[PDB]
Short mmCIF file of C-alpha atoms (C1' of nucleotides) and ligand atoms in Angstrom, two decimals:
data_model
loop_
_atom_site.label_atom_id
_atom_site.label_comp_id
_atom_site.label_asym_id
_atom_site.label_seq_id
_atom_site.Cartn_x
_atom_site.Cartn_y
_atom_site.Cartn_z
CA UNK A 1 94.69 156.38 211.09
CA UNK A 2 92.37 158.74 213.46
CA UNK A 3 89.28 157.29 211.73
CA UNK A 4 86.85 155.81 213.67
CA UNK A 5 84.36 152.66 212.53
CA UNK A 6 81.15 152.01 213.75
CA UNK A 7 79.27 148.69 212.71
CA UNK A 8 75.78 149.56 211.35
CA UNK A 9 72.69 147.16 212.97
CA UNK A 10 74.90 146.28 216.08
CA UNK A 11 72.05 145.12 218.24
CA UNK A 12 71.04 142.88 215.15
CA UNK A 13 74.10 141.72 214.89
CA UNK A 14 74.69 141.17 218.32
CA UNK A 15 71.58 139.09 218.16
CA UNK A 16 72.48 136.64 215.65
CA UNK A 17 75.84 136.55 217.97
CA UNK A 18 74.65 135.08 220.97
CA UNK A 19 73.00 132.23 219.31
CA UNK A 20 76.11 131.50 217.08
CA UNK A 21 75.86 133.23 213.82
CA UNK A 22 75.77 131.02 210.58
CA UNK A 23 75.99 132.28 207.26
CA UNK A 24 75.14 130.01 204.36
CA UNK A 25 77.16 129.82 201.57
CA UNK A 26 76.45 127.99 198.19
CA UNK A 27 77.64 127.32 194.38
CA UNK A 28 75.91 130.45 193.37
CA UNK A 29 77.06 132.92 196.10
CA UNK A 30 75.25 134.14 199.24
CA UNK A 31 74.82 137.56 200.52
CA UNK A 32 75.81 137.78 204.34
CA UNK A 33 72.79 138.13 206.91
CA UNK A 34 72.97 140.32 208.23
CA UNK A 35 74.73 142.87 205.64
CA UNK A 36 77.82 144.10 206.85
CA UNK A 37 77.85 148.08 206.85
CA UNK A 38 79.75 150.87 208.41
CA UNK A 39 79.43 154.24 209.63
CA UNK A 40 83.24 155.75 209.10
CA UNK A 41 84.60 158.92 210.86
CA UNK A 42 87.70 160.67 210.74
CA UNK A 43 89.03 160.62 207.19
CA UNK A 44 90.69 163.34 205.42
CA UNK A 45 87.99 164.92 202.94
CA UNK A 46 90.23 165.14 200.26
CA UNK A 47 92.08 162.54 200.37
CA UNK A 48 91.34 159.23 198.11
CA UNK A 49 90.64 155.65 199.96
CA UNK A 50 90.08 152.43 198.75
CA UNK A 51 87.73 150.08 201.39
CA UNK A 52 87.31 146.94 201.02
CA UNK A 53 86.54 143.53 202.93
CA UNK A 54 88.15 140.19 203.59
CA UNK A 55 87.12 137.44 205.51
CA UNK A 56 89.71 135.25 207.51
CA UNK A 57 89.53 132.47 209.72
CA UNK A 58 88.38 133.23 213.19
CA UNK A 59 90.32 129.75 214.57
CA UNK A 60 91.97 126.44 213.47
CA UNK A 61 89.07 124.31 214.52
CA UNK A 62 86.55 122.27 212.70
CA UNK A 63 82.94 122.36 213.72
CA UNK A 64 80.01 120.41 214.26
CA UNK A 65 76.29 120.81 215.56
CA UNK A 66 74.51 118.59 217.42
CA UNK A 67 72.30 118.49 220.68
CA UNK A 68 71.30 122.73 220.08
CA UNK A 69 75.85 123.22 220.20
CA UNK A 70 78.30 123.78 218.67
CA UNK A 71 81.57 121.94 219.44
CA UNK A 72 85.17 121.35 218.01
CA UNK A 73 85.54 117.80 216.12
CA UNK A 74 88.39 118.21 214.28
CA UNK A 75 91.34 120.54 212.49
CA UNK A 76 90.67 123.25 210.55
CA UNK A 77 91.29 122.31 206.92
CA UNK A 78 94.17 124.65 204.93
CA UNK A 79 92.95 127.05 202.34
CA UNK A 80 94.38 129.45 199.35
CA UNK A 81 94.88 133.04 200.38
CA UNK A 82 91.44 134.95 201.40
CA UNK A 83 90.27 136.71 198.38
CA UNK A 84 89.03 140.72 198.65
CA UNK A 85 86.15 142.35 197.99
CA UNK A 86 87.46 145.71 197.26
CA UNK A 87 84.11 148.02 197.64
CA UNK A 88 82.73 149.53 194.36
CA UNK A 89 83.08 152.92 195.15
CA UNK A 90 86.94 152.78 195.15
CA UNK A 91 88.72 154.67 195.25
CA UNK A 92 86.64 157.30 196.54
CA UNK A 93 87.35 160.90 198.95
CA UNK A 94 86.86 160.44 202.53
CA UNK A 95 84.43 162.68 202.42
CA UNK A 96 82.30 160.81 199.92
CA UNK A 97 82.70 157.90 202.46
CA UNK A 98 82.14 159.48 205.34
CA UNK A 99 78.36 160.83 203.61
CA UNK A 100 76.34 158.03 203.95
CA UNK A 101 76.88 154.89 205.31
CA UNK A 102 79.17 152.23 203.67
CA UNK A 103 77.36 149.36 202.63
CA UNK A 104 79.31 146.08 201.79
CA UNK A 105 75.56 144.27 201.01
CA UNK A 106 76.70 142.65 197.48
CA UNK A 107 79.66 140.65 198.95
CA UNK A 108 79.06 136.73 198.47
CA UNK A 109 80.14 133.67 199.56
CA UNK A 110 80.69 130.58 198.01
CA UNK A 111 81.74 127.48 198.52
CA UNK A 112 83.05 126.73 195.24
CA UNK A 113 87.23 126.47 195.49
CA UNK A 114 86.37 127.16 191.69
CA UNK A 115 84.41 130.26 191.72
CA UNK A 116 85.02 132.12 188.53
CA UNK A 117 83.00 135.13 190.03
CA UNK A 118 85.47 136.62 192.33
CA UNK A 119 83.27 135.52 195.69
CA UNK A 120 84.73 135.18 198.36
CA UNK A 121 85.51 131.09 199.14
CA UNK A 122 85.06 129.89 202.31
CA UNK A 123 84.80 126.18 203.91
CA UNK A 124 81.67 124.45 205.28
CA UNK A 125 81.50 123.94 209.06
CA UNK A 126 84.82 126.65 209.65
CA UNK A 127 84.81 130.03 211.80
CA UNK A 128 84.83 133.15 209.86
CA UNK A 129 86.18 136.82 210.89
CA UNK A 130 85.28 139.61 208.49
CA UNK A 131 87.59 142.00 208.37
CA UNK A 132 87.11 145.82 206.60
CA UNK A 133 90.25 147.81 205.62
CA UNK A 134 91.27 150.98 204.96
CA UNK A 135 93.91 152.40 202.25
CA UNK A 136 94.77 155.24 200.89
CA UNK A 137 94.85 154.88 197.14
CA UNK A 138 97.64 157.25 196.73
CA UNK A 139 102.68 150.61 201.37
CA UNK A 140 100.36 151.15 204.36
CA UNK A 141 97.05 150.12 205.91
CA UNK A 142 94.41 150.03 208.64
CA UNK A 143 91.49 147.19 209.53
CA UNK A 144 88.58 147.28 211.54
CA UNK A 145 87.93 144.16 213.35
CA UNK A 146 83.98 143.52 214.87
CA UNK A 147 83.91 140.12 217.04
CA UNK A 148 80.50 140.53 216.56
CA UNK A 149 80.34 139.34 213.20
CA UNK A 150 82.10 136.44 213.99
CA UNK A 151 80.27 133.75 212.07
CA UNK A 152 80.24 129.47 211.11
CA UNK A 153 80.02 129.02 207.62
CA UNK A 154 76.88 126.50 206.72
CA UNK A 155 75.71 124.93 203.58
CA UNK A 156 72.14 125.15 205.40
CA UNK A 157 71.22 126.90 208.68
CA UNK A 158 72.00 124.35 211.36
CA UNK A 159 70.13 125.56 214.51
CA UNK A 160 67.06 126.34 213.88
CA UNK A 161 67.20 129.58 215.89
CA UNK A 162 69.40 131.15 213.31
CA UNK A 163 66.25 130.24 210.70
CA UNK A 164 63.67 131.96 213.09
CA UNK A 165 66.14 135.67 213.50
CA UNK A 166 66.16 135.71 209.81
CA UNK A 167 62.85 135.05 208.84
CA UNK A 168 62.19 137.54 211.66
CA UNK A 169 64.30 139.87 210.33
CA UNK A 170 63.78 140.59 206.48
CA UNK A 171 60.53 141.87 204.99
CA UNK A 172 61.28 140.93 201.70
CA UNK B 1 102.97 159.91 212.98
CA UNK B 2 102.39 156.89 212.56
CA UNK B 3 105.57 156.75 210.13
CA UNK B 4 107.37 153.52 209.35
CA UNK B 5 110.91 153.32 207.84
CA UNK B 6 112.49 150.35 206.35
CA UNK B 7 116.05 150.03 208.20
CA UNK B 8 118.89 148.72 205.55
CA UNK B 9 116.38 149.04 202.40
CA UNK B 10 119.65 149.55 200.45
CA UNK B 11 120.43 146.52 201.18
CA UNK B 12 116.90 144.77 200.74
CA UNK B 13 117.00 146.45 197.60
CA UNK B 14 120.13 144.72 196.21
CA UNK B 15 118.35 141.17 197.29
CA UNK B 16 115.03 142.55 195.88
CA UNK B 17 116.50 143.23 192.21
CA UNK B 18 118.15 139.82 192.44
CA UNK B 19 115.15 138.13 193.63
CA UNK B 20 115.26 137.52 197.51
CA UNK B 21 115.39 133.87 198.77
CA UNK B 22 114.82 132.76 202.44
CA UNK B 23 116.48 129.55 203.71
CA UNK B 24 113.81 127.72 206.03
CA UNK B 25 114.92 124.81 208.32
CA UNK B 26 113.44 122.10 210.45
CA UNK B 27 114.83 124.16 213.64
CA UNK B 28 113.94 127.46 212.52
CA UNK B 29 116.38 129.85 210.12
CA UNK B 30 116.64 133.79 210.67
CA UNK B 31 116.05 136.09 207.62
CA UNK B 32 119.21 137.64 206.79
CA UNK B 33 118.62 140.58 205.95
CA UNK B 34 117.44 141.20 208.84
CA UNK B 35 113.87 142.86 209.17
CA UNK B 36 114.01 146.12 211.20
CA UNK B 37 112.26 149.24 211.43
CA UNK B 38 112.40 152.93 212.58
CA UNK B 39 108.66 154.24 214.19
CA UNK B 40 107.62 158.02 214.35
CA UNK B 41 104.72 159.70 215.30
CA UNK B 42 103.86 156.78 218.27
CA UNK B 43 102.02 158.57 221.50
CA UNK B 44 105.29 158.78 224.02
CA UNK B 45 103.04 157.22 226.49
CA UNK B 46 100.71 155.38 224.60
CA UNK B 47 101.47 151.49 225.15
CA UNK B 48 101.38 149.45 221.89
CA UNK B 49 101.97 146.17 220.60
CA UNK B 50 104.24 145.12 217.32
CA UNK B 51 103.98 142.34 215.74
CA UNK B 52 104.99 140.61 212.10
CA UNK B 53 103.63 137.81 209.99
CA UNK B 54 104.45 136.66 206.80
CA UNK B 55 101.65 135.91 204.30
CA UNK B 56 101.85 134.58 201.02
CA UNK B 57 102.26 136.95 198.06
CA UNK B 58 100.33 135.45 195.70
CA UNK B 59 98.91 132.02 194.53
CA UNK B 60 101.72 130.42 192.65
CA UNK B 61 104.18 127.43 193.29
CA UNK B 62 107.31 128.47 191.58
CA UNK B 63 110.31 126.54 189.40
CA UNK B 64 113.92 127.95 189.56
CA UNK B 65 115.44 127.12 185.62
CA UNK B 66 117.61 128.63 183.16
CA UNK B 67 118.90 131.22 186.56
CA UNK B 68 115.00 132.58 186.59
CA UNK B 69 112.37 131.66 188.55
CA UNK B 70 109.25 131.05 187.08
CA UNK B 71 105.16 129.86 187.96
CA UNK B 72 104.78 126.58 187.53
CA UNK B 73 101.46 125.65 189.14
CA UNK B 74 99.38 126.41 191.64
CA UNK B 75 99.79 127.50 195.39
CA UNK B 76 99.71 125.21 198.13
CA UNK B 77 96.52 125.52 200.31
CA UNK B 78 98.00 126.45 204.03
CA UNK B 79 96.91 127.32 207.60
CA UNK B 80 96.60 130.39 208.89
CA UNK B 81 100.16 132.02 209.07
CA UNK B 82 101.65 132.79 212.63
CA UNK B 83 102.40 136.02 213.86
CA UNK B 84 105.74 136.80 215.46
CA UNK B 85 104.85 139.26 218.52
CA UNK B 86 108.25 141.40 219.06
CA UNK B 87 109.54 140.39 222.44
CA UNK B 88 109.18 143.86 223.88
CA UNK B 89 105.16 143.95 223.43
CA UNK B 90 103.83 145.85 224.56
CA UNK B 91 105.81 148.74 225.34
CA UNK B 92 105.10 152.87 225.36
CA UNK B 93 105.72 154.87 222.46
CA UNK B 94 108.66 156.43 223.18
CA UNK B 95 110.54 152.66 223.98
CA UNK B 96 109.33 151.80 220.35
CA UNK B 97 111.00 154.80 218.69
CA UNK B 98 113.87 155.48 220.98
CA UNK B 99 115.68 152.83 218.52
CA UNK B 100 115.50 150.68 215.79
CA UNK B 101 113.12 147.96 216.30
CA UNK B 102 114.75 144.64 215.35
CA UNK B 103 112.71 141.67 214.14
CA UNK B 104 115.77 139.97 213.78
CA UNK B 105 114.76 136.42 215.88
CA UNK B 106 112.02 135.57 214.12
CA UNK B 107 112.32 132.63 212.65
CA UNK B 108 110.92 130.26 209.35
CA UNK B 109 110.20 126.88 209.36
CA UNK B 110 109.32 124.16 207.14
CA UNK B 111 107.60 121.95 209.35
CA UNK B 112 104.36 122.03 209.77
CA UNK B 113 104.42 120.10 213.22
CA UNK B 114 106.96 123.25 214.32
CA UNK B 115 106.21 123.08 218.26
CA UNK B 116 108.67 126.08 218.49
CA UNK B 117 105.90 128.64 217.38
CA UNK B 118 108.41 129.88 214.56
CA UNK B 119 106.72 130.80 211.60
CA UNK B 120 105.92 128.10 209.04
CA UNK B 121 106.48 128.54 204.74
CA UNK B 122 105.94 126.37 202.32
CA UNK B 123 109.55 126.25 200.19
CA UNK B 124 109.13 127.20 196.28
CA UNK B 125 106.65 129.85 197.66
CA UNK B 126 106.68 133.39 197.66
CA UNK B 127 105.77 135.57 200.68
CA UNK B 128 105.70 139.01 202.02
CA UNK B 129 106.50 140.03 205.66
CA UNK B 130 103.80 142.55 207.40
CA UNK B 131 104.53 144.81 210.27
CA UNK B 132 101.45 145.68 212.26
CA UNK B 133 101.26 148.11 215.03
CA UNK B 134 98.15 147.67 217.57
CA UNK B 135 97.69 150.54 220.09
CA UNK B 136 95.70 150.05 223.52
CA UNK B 137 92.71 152.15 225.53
CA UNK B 138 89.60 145.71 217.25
CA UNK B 139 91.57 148.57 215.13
CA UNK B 140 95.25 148.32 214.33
CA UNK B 141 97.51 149.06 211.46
CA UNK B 142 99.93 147.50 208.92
CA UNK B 143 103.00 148.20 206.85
CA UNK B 144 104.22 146.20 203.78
CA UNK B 145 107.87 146.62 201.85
CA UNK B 146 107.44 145.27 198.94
CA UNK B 147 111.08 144.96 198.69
CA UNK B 148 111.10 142.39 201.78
CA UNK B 149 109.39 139.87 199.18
CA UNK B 150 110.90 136.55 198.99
CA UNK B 151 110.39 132.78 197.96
CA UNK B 152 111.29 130.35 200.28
CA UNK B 153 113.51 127.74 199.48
CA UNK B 154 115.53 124.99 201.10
CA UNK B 155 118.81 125.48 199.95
CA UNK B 156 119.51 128.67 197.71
CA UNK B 157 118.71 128.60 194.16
CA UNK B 158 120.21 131.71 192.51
CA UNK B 159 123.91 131.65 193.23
CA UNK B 160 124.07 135.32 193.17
CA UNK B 161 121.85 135.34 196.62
CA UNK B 162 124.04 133.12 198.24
CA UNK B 163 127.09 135.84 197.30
CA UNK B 164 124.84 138.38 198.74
CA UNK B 165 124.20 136.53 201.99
CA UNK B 166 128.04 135.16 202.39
CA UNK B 167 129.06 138.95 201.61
CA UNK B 168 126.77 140.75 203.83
CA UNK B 169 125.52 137.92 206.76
CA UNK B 170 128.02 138.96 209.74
CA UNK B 171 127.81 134.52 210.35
CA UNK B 172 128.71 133.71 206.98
CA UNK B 173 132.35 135.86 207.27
CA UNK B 174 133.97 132.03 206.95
CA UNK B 175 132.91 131.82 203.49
CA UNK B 176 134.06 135.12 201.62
CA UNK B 177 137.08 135.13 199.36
"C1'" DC C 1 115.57 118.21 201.39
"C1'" DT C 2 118.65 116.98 205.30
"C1'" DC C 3 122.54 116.71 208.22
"C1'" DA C 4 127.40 116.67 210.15
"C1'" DC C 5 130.48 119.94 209.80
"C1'" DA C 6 134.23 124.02 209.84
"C1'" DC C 7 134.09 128.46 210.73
"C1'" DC C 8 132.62 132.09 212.33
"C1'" DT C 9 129.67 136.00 215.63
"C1'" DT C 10 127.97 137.43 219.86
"C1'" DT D 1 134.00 131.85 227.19
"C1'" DA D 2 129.85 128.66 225.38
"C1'" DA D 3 125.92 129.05 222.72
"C1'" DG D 4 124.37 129.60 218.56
"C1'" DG D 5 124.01 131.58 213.27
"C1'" DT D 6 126.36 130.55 208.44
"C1'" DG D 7 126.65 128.01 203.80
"C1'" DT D 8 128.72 123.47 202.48
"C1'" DG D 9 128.35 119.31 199.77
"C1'" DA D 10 127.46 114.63 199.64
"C1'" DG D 11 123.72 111.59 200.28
MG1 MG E 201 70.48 143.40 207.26
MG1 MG E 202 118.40 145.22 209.17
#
DNA sequence: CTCACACCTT
DNA sequence: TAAGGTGTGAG
């Protein structure tokens, strides 16, 4: 639990922050933009880790936008337990996650309490914290926690701000 | 370091292989047993910050029938569980392993109005308590017993828990043969 | 599921 | 002490 976590594409990320990140979610399942990825530091070589991603609520609020804000317009609504996303490469030896950066760019979100895909479900117009954890594969646990990537769920971008950073910000 | 030992887990065990059940209450009922840990390998100095919740252990709403509990549908959607910050937070180290930590105040509740901040199940549920241990200058850690898994209920089901309880609960001495 | 209650601990 | 944690058992 001497590891170390470092969020890859801060200053993007930090971008997307100060305007009030949204992340669009959908029947289908959306990717997260930005992609969430880490640089991690401090892991035994040998020893096997499963990583893997969940994505709480940030707050017990409801949201709305309107006049360029956001504001709070009524209680959170109550939801099943988070599901995982339990990265494909575990379990793996911290030093094949320590090699290269770990990239969590296939998790999706949907907004389907039915999903039959294993997405993760989240609510429209709710505050999201992704979380990343760490655990050796072998009853105990450590998680990473980046403010940063706090984020509003949308069912369509909502400032238009948010639309002009991400058509900025992806080739293609 | 960081090591964390289940105080009692004789005891939890017995419950466990039974099948544990939690009375919760409008005003807020105790666990019994009650939750408490050992800590090694803290920094002495170090100043850090413990702290439980209790999160549901899966998505099920359970029947008790025929003495067995069983699924019978699915889990209630809920709010975010609260956490139960131990009274000494934050402390050094060397407070934290000097003795047994004792979570034994914490509370459950089944009303979800509870203005006492005690922490609110849903009865016919089952749950695990977490420990989690947050250090100081984000990250933190957590620690799950699996044998500290119970359903909630709101008056005891299996009649072989409520011997358990009666024979082992200090405040239930009245009722013992 | 709830409450007044006897009986007990701290 | 006096305050407060138990399961009870009928409703
Ligand atoms: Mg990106
Ligand atoms: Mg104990």
């Amino acid at each position: 639990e001497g590891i170390k976590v470092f969020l890859h594409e801060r200053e993007l990320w930090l971008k997307f922050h100060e305007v009030g990140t949204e992340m669009i979610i959908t029947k289908a399942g959306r990717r997260m933009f930005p992609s969430y990825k880490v640089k991690v530091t401090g892991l035994n070589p040998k020893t096997k880790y499963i990583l893997l991603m969940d994505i709480v609520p940030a707050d017990d609020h409801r949201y709305k936008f309107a006049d360029n804000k956001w504001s709070v317009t009524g209680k959170a609504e109550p939801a099943m337990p988070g599901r995982l996303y339990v990265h494909p490469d575990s379990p793996a030896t911290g030093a094949h996650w320590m090699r290269q950066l770990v990239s969590f760019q296939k998790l999706k979100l949907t907004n389907n309490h039915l999903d039959p895909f294993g997405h993760i479900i989240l609510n429209s117009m709710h505050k999201y914290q992704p979380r990343l954890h760490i655990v050796k594969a072998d009853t105990a646990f450590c998680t990473h926690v980046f403010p940063e990537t706090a984020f509003i769920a949308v069912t369509s971008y909502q400032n238009h701000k948010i639309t002009q950073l991400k058509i900025e910000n992806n080739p293609f």
